[PDB]
């Protein structure tokens, strides 16, 4: 494939709704502490508190709603 992605961080701001067929993935809007102007929408599985920090592998791809 020959594709290399840099390590990306995150910072949650406000909680949102929950997606998934059984409600296991939770929407949350984030900010990047590396560059405090870009905000993307992602899904997180697991408990999330506001004021926490998330780890990623890439921050260039967004996810759909269901399918």
Partner RNA sequence: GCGCAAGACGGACCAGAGCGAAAGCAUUUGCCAAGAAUGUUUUCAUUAAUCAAGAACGAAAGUCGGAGGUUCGAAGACGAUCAGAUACCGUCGUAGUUCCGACCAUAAACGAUGCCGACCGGCGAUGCGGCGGCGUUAUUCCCAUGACCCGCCGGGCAGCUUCCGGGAAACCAAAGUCUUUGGGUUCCGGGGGGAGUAUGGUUGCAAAGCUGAAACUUAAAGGAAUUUGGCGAAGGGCACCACC
Rounded CA-CA distance 13/3 in Å is 30
Shortest gap between Cβ of 30 and RNA (angstroms)?
A: 22
Shortest gap between Cβ of 56 and RNA (angstroms)?
A: 22
Instruction: Return the number of the residue (13 or 24) whose C-beta is nearest RNA.
Output: 24
Q: What angle do CA 30, 67, 12 make, to 5 degrees?
A: 10
Residue 63 near residue 41 (C-beta atoms within 8 A): yes
Site for RNA in 10-39 (CB under 7 A): 22-24
**Residues at the site binding RNA, with contacts judged by CB under 7 A:** 22-24
């Amino acid at each position: 494939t020959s594709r290399v992605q840099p390590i990306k961080l995150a910072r949650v701001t406000k909680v949102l709704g929950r997606t998934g067929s059984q409600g296991q993935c939770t929407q949350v809007r984030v900010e990047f502490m590396d560059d405090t102007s870009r905000s993307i929408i992602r899904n997180v599985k697991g408990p999330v508190r506001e004021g926490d920090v998330l780890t990623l592998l890439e921050s260039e791809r967004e996810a759909r709603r269901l399918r």
